[PDB]
Each structure stands twice: as C-alpha cells, then as structure tokens.
Design a protein around this ligand. Structure first.
Ligand SMILES: Cc1cn([C@H]2C[C@H](O)[C@@H](CO)O2)c(=O)[nH]c1=O
Ligand SMILES: Cc1cn([C@H]2C[C@H](O)[C@@H](CO)O2)c(=O)[nH]c1=O
Ligand SMILES: Cc1cn([C@H]2C[C@H](O)[C@@H](CO)O2)c(=O)[nH]c1=O
Ligand SMILES: Cc1cn([C@H]2C[C@H](O)[C@@H](CO)O2)c(=O)[nH]c1=O
Lengths: 440, 440
C-alpha cells in the first residue's frame, strides 16, 4: 500500500523515477490508495529536484491515461484533431475565434475548457453568457458536433485526468504549484486526453500572467513543447503579451460580443488579431493543413473575410443549444449591464503600465467572477473600449467603459481602474503582441 | 518613421552617424518601427564602412539603453560593480569560482547569464543541478543578495539590450554577423546593462574558440576593450586557451562539484586555476580593489586558503534557495548518474589533440545539454577525470570517466570520446593556459 514512501524516498534523494513507479504512484492518486501527505511529499521533492524528459513524459501520459482518452479514428474525419491552451489572461478571448477559424480551414477542434480561475476570465463562463448555450453535451451530441460543425467548446467532465484533480488540489495548499514539470503535467494531462494530433500553447507574459518573468514563461513554454511532442503530439508554443488587456474588453457577454464582431469583420483589435492569427497559423501548420506560415495565414484570412469562420461559430452555438441566429442578432441575446459609464484618468500623459492582475480582480469584484462556487456570475458586467499601452490620455480620452450593476459597484471599479493604469510624461517603449515562436 | 532610410543613406555614403541617429535607429529596431530590410541595409553598410570609436560607443550604449539598466546608487555600496564575460568553451566553469573569489575581496558581482546554445554549456544549467537553486530572483531579492553576499548568478536577460534580438537575428541571415563593431556591440551591450564599474573579457583562443585564429581573437579583444572603456566601464581582456577542456569535468553536477573542490582546495586543476586567477586579477585591478598583479594574487590566493571564497559561494547558494550547507555536503545534494565508468583508448600513445566541440556535443547527446531548446537536461551526466593534452595513455590510464544514465548512452559517449581524442607516438609540445593581457 504505502510503497509510495519508497518512491518518495527515491526522489527525495535525487534519483530519477521510472515509468512503472510514476504510473503506480499516479494510479494510487486516482484510487485513493495513496495518502494526501504522500502526494504533498512527492510533490515537494519534485519542486526541489525537478524531473527529466522521460519522467515528465511518463508523468503526463500517466495522468492522461488515469481517466478517459477520446478516440477519433472511429469517425474517419478527413482532418487533424487539434486544440489550443492558454495559461489565461484578461481579455483573453482568442479561443472563441480560433476554434471556428481552424474548423473553417479543415481542423477538428475538441476544446475542453474551464471556468475563470482567480483573476483570469475562463472561456466556459463566457460562452455561458449566451442563453441556453450548453457546455455539457453527451458523447453522441458531442461527437456529432465535431463531425458536423468541426468545433465544440465544452466543460471538463469528471472523467478527465481525475488523478490530476487530487494532485493539483494538494499542490494548491502545500506551496507546490510553482513547479514547471508539475504544471506541465497537469496542463498536458487534460489537453492530451482529448486525443489530439496537434496542439499549440499560448503562454502569457507580463503583469497579468501566470509566470511573473519572461524567462519563467519561456521555461514553461519550452517544457510544454518538449513534453507534448515527447508524448507524440506535434506541438508549438507562442509567448504572448499580457501586460495589458488583450481584447478591447474584459468580462463575459462583452467578450462574446467582441468575438462575433471579430469573426464577421465588424471590428478587429490589432493586438488581438496578431495573437489570434499566429496561434491559428501554428495549429494549421502542425495539423498539416499548410506547408508554411504564409499558406496558413492566407487560408485564415480567407475564412475571416468570406464569412466562413463567423458562419461556423454560428453553427456551433446553434449545435450547443444557443440561439439559431446568434451571430446575426447577438445584441438580441447578450445581457446588458444596468449602468455603463466611462472612467477618466486624473492626469494627462501617456499610458506606461497596466496592472492586469488588478483589472481582472476588479471584474471579479463586479460579479464577472465567482470567489466561490455557487456564486452566480453576473454575465453583463465588465470593461469595454479599453485604452491601450502607449496611448495618449487627456480629459476627453477615457481609460475604459465600465459596465456595473449599480453605482456603488461602478465607483469601486472606477477606483480600481484609475489605480491600475500608470501614466508617464514620456511615451514608453512599444510591446510586441507575440514575442517568440517555439518549436521542436 | 523612415528617417531610417536617411540614416542608412548617411552611413552608406561613408559618413559617421551621430549619437542621436544611432539611438533613434536602435530604438526603432526594438519597437519594430524600423523594417527588417532597413536593419539589413544598415548592417551591411556598417559591414562595409566600419565605425569610428565614437560610433561604436554610441551603438553599444544605445543597445545598452534599449532596455533595463541596473542602477546601484541607491544602495550606497562601498565597492566596485564588476563582472566577467566570455566567448565561452567546454568545461569553462570559471564563473562559479570567480564570482565568489572577487566578492570575497570586496567586489559586487551581479552575474546575469544566458541559456540554450550549442556545443558549449551554460552557467545557469550548471547551477540548476543544485536542488532548490533559483536563477530567477526578483529585483529586490537580487539587490538584497548582491548587498549581503556580494554575488548572485541569475538569468533575466530578456529586459536587457532587447534591440539586439532583432538586430542579431537579421545579421544572421544576411551575412552581416561578421563585423567587429556589430559583434562588439552585441557581445558587450547585455553585459553593460548590469551597470558595471569594471569588467574583464575572456576571449578564447584555439581549436575550440569562437574566433578561428589567434590574430582574430586578439582583434576582437582589442575592439571590446576600446568600446567598453569608451562606454565608461574599466575593461581589459585576456586571450585564454581553448585547445582542450579547461576543467577536468564537462557537464553540470560534475562541473559544480569541481567548482566547489576548486574553492575548498580539495582539487584545483592547474590550467583552470591559471585562467580563473588571471581573470580574477583583472577584476580586482580594473575595479580598484588591488594595486597590481601581486597584491591581487595575494588577496585571491588568501580567500582560497582560508575557505572564505568557498564560504561566499555557499552563502550565495543559500541566498538563492539552495541548501544552507551545500559546501560541506555537496555530494549529498548533487544528482548522481546511474552509471559511471572509465573509457580507455583503443591504442597507446600521447594525447596530441582534442576536438572540444565534439566532446561538448558528446555531453549534449548524453542529455547533458540541449539540441533543441525544448529539450530537458539530465544534470547528473557528463565526463570527469579528463585526460589532458600531453598525457601518456595506455590500458592503465583512461581517457575520461563517463557518467551516463544507462549503458547504451555510455557506450555511445565512449565512441564519441575515443573519436574526439587524437593520440600520437611522440609527446606534443605544451602551451600556456593564459596568453596575452589586453589593456588598450
Ligand atoms: C498552475 C496550474 C494552472 N492550470 C490552469 C492553466 C490554465 O490557466 C487552466 C485551464 O483550465 O488551468 C492547470 O491546469 N494546472 C496547473 O498546475
Ligand atoms: C466597431 C468597433 C467596436 N469596438 C468594440 C469591440 C468590442 O465590442 C468593444 C470592446 O471594448 O469595443 C471598438 O473598440 N472599436 C470599433 O470600431
Ligand atoms: C557574432 C556574435 C556571437 N556571439 C556569440 C559569441 C559567443 O560565442 C557567445 C557569447 O556567449 O555568443 C554573440 O553573443 N554576439 C554576436 O554578435
Ligand atoms: C583529487 C583529484 C580530483 N580530480 C577531479 C576529477 C574530477 O573531474 C573532479 C571531481 O568532479 O575531481 C582530478 O582530476 N585529479 C585528482 O587528483
């Protein structure tokens, strides 16, 4: 039973574990045959001693195989099974476009997502701003949507890398979250359960990012590329900026609106376009729907610009019990805040910094996020019309438009926002939106 | 925006660019306002017309200022901010001893290093063999460490001389890499960003070096010294030998072990010692901590003999979250290969030459480094007990001891080491470890 202690001792002393050892230990996490403190202790030895590529691959494959793994050869799709994952951000709406776009160019995209965690908005909370939108279809409904529409964005079912449930739960109370190979293992366990042929990872950089410094973000990205490819899934990673809000809006309904206007062509945020297109390029190339970058981009502009991508977003929503006509009449269905007013800076000058962590928090404090489950989310609140880094601010140029349920709520977000945007007399250095492509 | 093209035209027609033009062009590279082609054009005219000393100083100060530049004034430190920089080589572990030694004699040494790279292996990879050791403290941590210990070895190069990324990338596809003022600015800027008072540069010479001939090494070294001195940083260079491995080890854990034994005195390879000494001497003198070569050597030798240098390295490991007791107990923490075993030459004779790049590559294939940046390092593997040029070889005197993760890689590394080391019937001549000192 507690032969796990043996596996702990072996790693406490700086020796590599083997597949059977790792497999054993994981399967015991899943089965409850292994104690909490035994998970904590193993976790903390890995934080101190790290892991090697064969360990990392073994740990991911073992957590991935601890629950269901989706099988697609059964349905003879003529294209690649591909997905994308993001360490999260504020305004990180990219998936709502990216799925449809890739589907539009041949990909089959089974996107299992999650809810807002901490200060970052989660995709499922955004899609559930769409009335009747159902993130939990059954196998039949689900496979059919992927076969017909080509993309679906569903919640995490309990059968998905359940070893990770307890593993992460213990990590998060034992100061053992901050370990690249452990992070890499939980992230990839899930995404690989999907049965992928290819994957792209969007690793955020900056004030509103998971990892605090660029090089740590790089480190995680490199690790994920290595392990995922190591696991037999062609994978690339992009390091993308999160030093300001990526969309022009933050929230739930307001982000769904932006996604639709992006796909139809009503409006495209320049920074959001870059990060979105590049991630879409990667999936295409990796899934072999394109030779190089230009053939990828050309095909992706194509479906952006002939309505095919907006069209397939519309079908997906229709498939998952959303409104039939949602793309055409999104304002008919998206909730509206009771109160919508601009907030203005106190000084003149240029925007030099944005505390994105804090903006993310402020949206949660308005009801966009839940502090604890069984909190009902207000889907109408958020920010729109964000000022951006570099921008010149005066009295008639607002920092954002804040959407609140009442004035007390509004005033509080106003304060948060003014506090989180710094202005200098000097216009600052430019920030690229994509920093680095990373490949095997 | 394309005052760029004016600047290209100015340089093209053989004039000297002004500081302000150079600063404008460099920042345009960082912000991406200046096109790749324009960068290529600029580099190629520099390649053709060279640059005056003033232009060289401006170009490297502009790259230095293109990102973060550490300011130490506010800590009122009462010694010099000093560092080493190197063109690098195999078994070049000097930094691990040189930082502790110079700090013990009153210098402050903020070593900021890099990652990835090829045949030669990074300092941060090496330190990361120490469980728990953190190469990414935050700024206040860093200052606190430099303030309290006097040395720290971290890895946050991202916010330093960012202009050089696009610059170098572009140089490297247009055949404009090979220009001494471009090389000088690239090599020197990241290091000048640490805000140094003094600096020594180690330019390797020999088969394993970055410049192919002694002549060219000397040229580069004179350039770097001219520029760094014009940039207000007191600098000298040394030509040091790279025709064989410098230390007796090649790898990570094995090179940390050698470094600690060098400092405690348990073992000091004579060739490594000579180099490490010569470089530490430049640092004390340039940074005004010693009046001449003999006071410096005395001060350095002393902190070796009384374990003070060793103690500084220990406090540094502690301050950067390794074990407090690393120096007394390094064998308890450092990872150990599953298999370690000597390799014997096929024939008998003297070692007459050695392909260091190959040896370096042999270590990488063992997992001791990275072919792909997505690759993960096995810290436990590498070579020890390296035979040296001039050594008599036979069945009782092995080439090296290979530390491998399994017999298959061992057997593989052993062919690599046999092939790399060329024996001869008659002894070769010997050369110095340290060649010319350059003060310009
Ligand atoms: C730290 C950590 C975050 N996450 C986050 C990353 C993503 O932002 C989110 C996906 O729902 O889960 C993990 O899945 N595992 C982890 O170990
Ligand atoms: C048409 C248009 C919409 N928007 C919207 C898109 C999003 O719905 C909103 C989020 O701030 O801003 C602009 O920022 N500029 C525009 O020109
Ligand atoms: C040409 C060139 C090489 N390098 C290489 C030389 C050295 O081998 C290494 C510095 O550690 O990087 C630069 O850093 N900048 C340059 O411009
Ligand atoms: C004591 C001793 C150690 N060493 C070195 C071999 C290894 O490279 C190092 C231990 O890592 O110590 C020698 O080369 N000769 C000696 O006499």
């Amino acid at each position: 039973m507690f032969l796990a202690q043996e596996i702990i001792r072996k790693k406490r002393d700086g020796h590599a574990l083997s597949d059977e050892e790792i497999r054993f230990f994981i399967n015991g996490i899943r089965d409850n045959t292994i104690s909490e403190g035994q998970i904590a202790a193993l976790a903390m030895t890995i934080f101190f001693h790290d892991m090697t590529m064969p360990e990392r691959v073994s740990l991911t494959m073992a957590m991935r195989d601890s629950g269901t793994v989706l099988d697609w050869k059964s349905l003879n799709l003529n294209g690649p099974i591909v997905d994308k994952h993001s360490t999260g951000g504020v305004g990180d709406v990219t998936s709502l476009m990216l799925g449809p776009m890739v589907a539009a160019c041949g990909g089959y995209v089974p996107m299992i997502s999650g809810r807002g965690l901490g200060h970052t908005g989660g995709t499922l909370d955004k899609l559930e701003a769409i009335p009747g939108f159902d993130i939990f279809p059954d196998d039949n409904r689900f496979r059919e949507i992927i076969q017909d529409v080509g993309v679906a964005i569903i919640g995490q079912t309990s059968s998905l890398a359940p070893a990770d449930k307890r593993f992460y739960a213990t990590r998060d109370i034992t100061a053992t979250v901050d370990s690249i190979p452990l992070i890499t293992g939980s992230i990839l366990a899930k995404k690989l359960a999907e049965g992928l042929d290819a994957l792209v990872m969007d690793v955020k950089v900056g004030s509103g990012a998971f990892m605090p410094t660029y090089e740590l973000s790089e480190a995680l990205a490199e690790a994920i590329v290595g392990v995922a490819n190591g696991a037999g899934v062609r994978t690339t990673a992009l390091l993308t900026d999160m030093n300001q809000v990526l969309a022009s809006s933050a929230g739930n309904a307001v982000e769904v609106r932006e996604a639709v206007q992006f796909l139809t062509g009503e409006y495209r945020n320049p920074r959001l376009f870059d990060v979105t297109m590049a991630l879409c390029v990667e999936m295409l190339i990796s899934g072999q729907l394109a030779k190089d970058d230009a053939e990828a981009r050309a095909k992706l502009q194509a479906v952006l610009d002939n309505g095919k991508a907006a069209e397939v977003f519309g079908r997906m929503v229709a498939a998952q019990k959303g409104p039939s006509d949602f793309v055409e009449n999104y304002d008919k269905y998206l909730p509206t805040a009771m109160l919508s007013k601009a907030v203005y800076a106190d000084t003149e000058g240029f925007i030099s910094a944005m505390d994105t962590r804090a903006l993310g928090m402020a949206v949660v404090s308005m009801g966009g996020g839940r502090r604890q489950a069984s909190d009902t989310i207000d889907y109408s609140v958020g920010f729109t019309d964000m000022a951006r880094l570099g921008d010149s601010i005066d009295g008639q140029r607002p920092l954002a438009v804040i959407h609140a349920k009442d004035e007390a709520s509004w005033q509080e977000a106003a304060k948060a926002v003014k506090a989180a945007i710094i202005l200098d007399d000097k216009a600052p250095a430019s920030t690229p939106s994509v920093y680095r492509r990373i490949t095997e």
